[PDB]
Design a protein around this ligand. Structure first.
Ligand code: W35
Lengths: 236, 273, 40, 255, 236, 40, 59
């Protein structure tokens, strides 16, 4: 008989501990694995695939239309859309990125925001996208917007433009749930010159917008998502 | 190691005891610069004054309480202490607080011990055996609303289940967002005119929530939770003046008005012994 | 040290440290180079 | 013939000479340096205006009189309006800097008086209200004027009680912070070099001040007979190794 | 199954024990450390920085004035100040040294007591500081004082004088909380000749006094400080 | 022997045995020698 | 001045393009030297050549 002493914590059950256990089914042989395409190893692998952002959130019931950012022909100087960058809330929240970020407490890294244009091929347009780093207000006019991170996008044969929100930060991690100290800025978009439709054409054209994370990205300290809850256990 | 070397009479032009304190230095003067000494050894290393040792013992950081009782007809579990929580923080109880605030920035892993004891202040046939389930709820997680919400499923959130009367123990890595925790912060969360000032803005680390897993027996049972915290792997920067006045709030430096003189007045003269 | 005979009884696995998003981010048949035109 | 006593500091397009110094302190024995990559987080290239921001700004002068309690300035606040340093400050999202602080006060060999000049990293002030009353923004951002510890309590402002350092600690122990005395009989200036001290590699220059400079009379000013009973104290400060990052629109701050 | 026996003490929680525990956050990655000037490793490092002693304790509410020891022109033979050396109490108690000593039960070592003179530059003075080792009473006149550890200080260009209270003791440790057997002596200061002010000058001049520990110093057996207490838990 | 995988779970650290008060006691720019005059 | 007096002056050079400074705050933002009156009786300020054009007219 070897002398032992038990410490504080004996008998506790910590849902996060990782130890060995007896197998209830001694000697059982599991089914062989066969090959299946698509294996995922890290959630970091999947948040780099871009998905659509319901940017046009202004509706009243969920609709395919809140994915469409409208553009008006012949407007000059004006603003196309605006949003803050609380990736865990608001427009971002239902996107795959938003949806995964919510399983973690802290995030750090660059984001990739792209816009794909869908107007007739014989039209043309020049837009400016601007990222405003924390510390200033959402820009109120392009002059204000153009003094921060921006890209003049020229609509052409190449249909999409990929803007990166480079990680601009004092503190090396931000909270995924919106927090002030930790806030990330604003994203706005304005006409640089203006949309022009060809003859025989009319109305609004739309941009689709996507979001995905750069390879830069870090997420840490897992927790429970506000995105799902329940009141009684389900049954069959 | 010698604590003092042997030194004899001196009649020099080299005076180590005259200095100019205006410079900001504390010149390293020793007994042997001004009296005749004999050799003696230190026999000591200064082991128990290491900051790891100083901050490394468990201190009580929080006492809360929850009760097991019939929740039937309770409109606000939180309010009935059917479960309770704690807005994690290390500055609420002030013994450990004065020790940490000897430094400006501090970095360490935490080891928590949680002791839970039960009380049955009014007539019970017996003492029941309750299991507590303290669970960590970080910022931006579904806060729990009843004592038996979906929240308690805690599928992604670390939770420990232990018995009242026992102790639970586990250790959490340094969860700070920056490189160190700020013991002090002379800033705001943004440049608004009315936003709070301090660290309280800073050190919002989310809260911890406790509940009893047991349903109710015929009597009521009071369970009082004590959280102990031990720093391990300590790193501390920039020493500061120790706290002199009493504390009034978690996270602000504020002291109470009409406080009392903190320096003991002499019973006698400056000349008194 | 495993104290038990069966593999199911061992602790959690250890980090894939595999990580290759291209099956998801670039499943295109003809390779796209960043910087070269998307559609030629 | 070099003395600890005479010194020249040339920084940018500005030079200071003192003929009655008492050495100089370099906080925590470290000299200001730029931000190394290994410590970097923000991916933005930073801007280093060099000589246009790293020169000496002389703040407006104070007047030490027999009733003075002491003054307090915060950095980078005190410089929020000096030349291009200040512009850069309001225009970038993040910035970082070290400083050379030179406090000046000359008298004659008949005067007596002794000031403590100290730099306190992260000086979080206390509300004179007690409890958990906060200290509003404006109150902790006095600008070049600094805070006058002999001014009256105001509402939303900090407490100005000197034996307590504006935070619940005793004046006597401020000596644990980098500091230097100005003793009229010895000294006529104090110089402290401040390296950048923070828990993050770069921060916001407007929502967080990282040092308060404090000048406190400790041995009261005593002038010779029938002398005017006061002396001016001047503070000149120079940003050093300044870097700004995350340029944009230009912050708007309360008041 | 290996046979064990549990000993007395099993299940106890000793706040001072040091063992391993499961991490609640398996696999989490802490923020990188960056460099910060000022790291402290031992409390012994900081008690060697000198701080001011409120020697002039005679006031009735805390004031900047209890840091000032006054000096009178033209007095001869007389006594400037006196104090016992209970570093954990009395004048010493609020100083950084006093304040740290109070976290430990025992101390041993030499102390460094210095005085910085602040009078006009054209004045002059000679003072004697005397340390009286345990066993005799606080000296009552300089003759008595001068027979023990003393330094004649000549006020000059060099503004401060550093007196050392060399460790004089039978027992190798003393208690920080004042105790008789364990007591350390007295410190007094007297005019050696006298303070002389130049013409056109008048009144009192003051000395500032500091205390710090020599590298000699040892502190042991940590305990709780009488310097801080509370009646209800604080809240935000 | 560590029984656990993560570093936070290990016991207390071991004595710095670093100790260098000069950053606090002598942060002067020009070096002062004990015995030489303070102000030259 | 008498040897037992003391003074600290600032000399400022303002390069072409701005007006003569109107107060020290204005003055101190250009080339300047804080002069501390001491044992060393003179202070030598240099007006460094600040110029677009490499020669100026003497008239
Ligand atoms: C200074 C300072 C000190 C602190 C506290 C930091 C500790 C990190 C978060 O603390 C916990 C507490 C409990 C648990 C827990 N998980 C399962 C049960 O309890 C996890 C982390 O914040 N700033």
């Amino acid at each position: 008989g070897l002398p032992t002493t038990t410490l504080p914590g004996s008998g506790q059950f910590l849902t996060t501990d990782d130890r060995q256990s007896p197998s209830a089914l001694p000697n059982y042989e599991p089914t062989p694995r066969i090959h299946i395409p698509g294996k995922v190893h890290n959630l970091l692998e999947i948040i780099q695939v871009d998905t659509l952002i319901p940017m046009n959130n202004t509706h009243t019931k969920d609709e395919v239309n809140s994915y469409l950012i409208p553009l008006n022909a012949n407007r000059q100087n004006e603003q196309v859309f605006g949003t803050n960058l609380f990736i865990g809330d608001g427009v971002f929240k239902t996107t795959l990125l938003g949806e995964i970020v919510q399983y973690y407490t802290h995030w750090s890294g660059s984001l990739r925001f792209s816009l794909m244009y869908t107007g007739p091929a014989l039209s043309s347009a020049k837009l400016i996208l601007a990222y405003t780093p924390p510390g200033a207000r959402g820009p109120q006019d392009r002059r204000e917007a153009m003094l921060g991170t921006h890209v003049v996008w020229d609509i052409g044969l190449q249909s999409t433009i990929v803007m990166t929100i480079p990680w601009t930060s004092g503190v090396q991690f931000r909270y995924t749930d919106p927090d002030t100290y930790t806030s990330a800025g604003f994203l706005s978009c304005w006409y640089q010159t203006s949309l022009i439709l060809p003859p025989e054409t009319t109305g609004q054209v739309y941009l689709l917008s996507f979001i995905s994370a750069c390879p830069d990205f870090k997420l840490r300290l897992m927790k429970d998502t506000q995105t799902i809850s329940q009141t009684v256990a389900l049954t069959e | 190691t010698v604590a003092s070397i042997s030194s004899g009479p001196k009649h020099t032009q080299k005076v180590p005891i005259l200095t100019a304190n205006e410079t900001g230095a504390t010149m390293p003067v020793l007994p042997s610069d001004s009296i005749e000494t004999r050799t003696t050894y230190m026999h000591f290393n200064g082991s128990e004054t290491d900051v790891e040792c100083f901050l490394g013992r468990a201190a009580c950081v929080h006492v809360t309480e929850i009760q097991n009782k019939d929740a039937t007809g309770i409109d606000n579990h939180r309010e009935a202490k059917l479960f309770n929580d704690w807005k994690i923080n290390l500055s609420s109880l002030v013994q450990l607080r004065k020790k940490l605030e000897l430094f400006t920035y501090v970095r360490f892993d935490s080891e928590y011990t949680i002791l839970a004891t039960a009380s049955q202040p009014d007539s019970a046939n017996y003492s029941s055996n309750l299991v507590v389930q303290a669970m960590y709820v970080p910022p931006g997680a579904p806060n729990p609303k009843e004592w038996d919400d979906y929240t308690w499923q805690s599928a992604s959130n670390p939770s420990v289940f232990f018995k009242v009367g026992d102790t639970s123990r586990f250790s959490v890595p340094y969860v700070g967002l920056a490189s160190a925790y700020n013991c002090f912060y002379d800033g705001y969360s943004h440049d608004d005119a009315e936003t709070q000032y301090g660290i309280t803005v800073l050190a919002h680390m989310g809260s911890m929530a406790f509940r009893i897993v047991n349903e109710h027996d015929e009597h009521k049972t009071l369970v009082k939770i004590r959280v102990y915290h031990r720093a391990k792997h300590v790193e501390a920067w920039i020493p500061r003046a120790p706290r002199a006045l009493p504390y009034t709030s978690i996270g602000r430096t504020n002291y109470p008005k009409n406080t009392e003189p903190v320096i003991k007045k002499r019973k006698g003269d400056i000349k008194s012994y | 040290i495993n104290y038990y005979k069966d593999a199911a009884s061992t602790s959690s696995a250890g980090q894939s440290l595999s990580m290759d998003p291209s099956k998801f981010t670039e499943p295109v048949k003809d390779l796209m180079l960043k910087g070269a035109p998307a559609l030629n | 013939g070099y003395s600890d006593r005479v010194q020249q500091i040339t920084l940018g397009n500005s030079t200071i000479t003192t003929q009655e110094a008492a050495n100089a302190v370099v906080c925590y024995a470290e000299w200001p340096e730029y931000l190394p990559d290994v410590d970097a987080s923000d991916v933005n290239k930073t801007s280093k205006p060099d000589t246009s921001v790293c020169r000496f700004y002389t703040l407006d002068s104070k007047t030490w009189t027999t009733g003075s309690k002491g003054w307090c300035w915060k950095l980078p606040d005190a410089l929020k309006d000096m030349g291009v340093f200040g512009q850069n400050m309001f225009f970038h999202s993040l910035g970082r800097s070290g400083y050379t602080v030179h406090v000046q006060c000359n008298a004659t060999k008949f005067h007596s008086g002794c000031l403590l000049v100290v730099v306190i990293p992260e000086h979080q002030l206390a509300s004179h209200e007690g409890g958990n009353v906060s200290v509003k923004y404006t109150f902790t951002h006095p600008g070049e004027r600094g805070i006058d510890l002999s001014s009256a309590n105001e509402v939303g402002g900090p407490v100005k009680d000197v034996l307590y350092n504006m935070n619940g600690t005793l004046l006597g122990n401020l000596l644990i912070f980098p500091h230097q005395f100005i003793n009229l009989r010895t000294n006529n200036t104090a110089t402290i070099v401040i390296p950048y001290i923070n828990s993050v590699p770069i921060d916001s220059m407007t929502r967080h001040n990282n040092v308060s400079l404090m000048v406190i009379p400790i041995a009261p000013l005593t002038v010779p007979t029938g002398a005017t009973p006061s002396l001016p104290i001047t503070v000149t400060i120079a940003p050093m190794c300044t870097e700004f990052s995350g340029i944009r629109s230009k912050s708007i701050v309360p008041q």
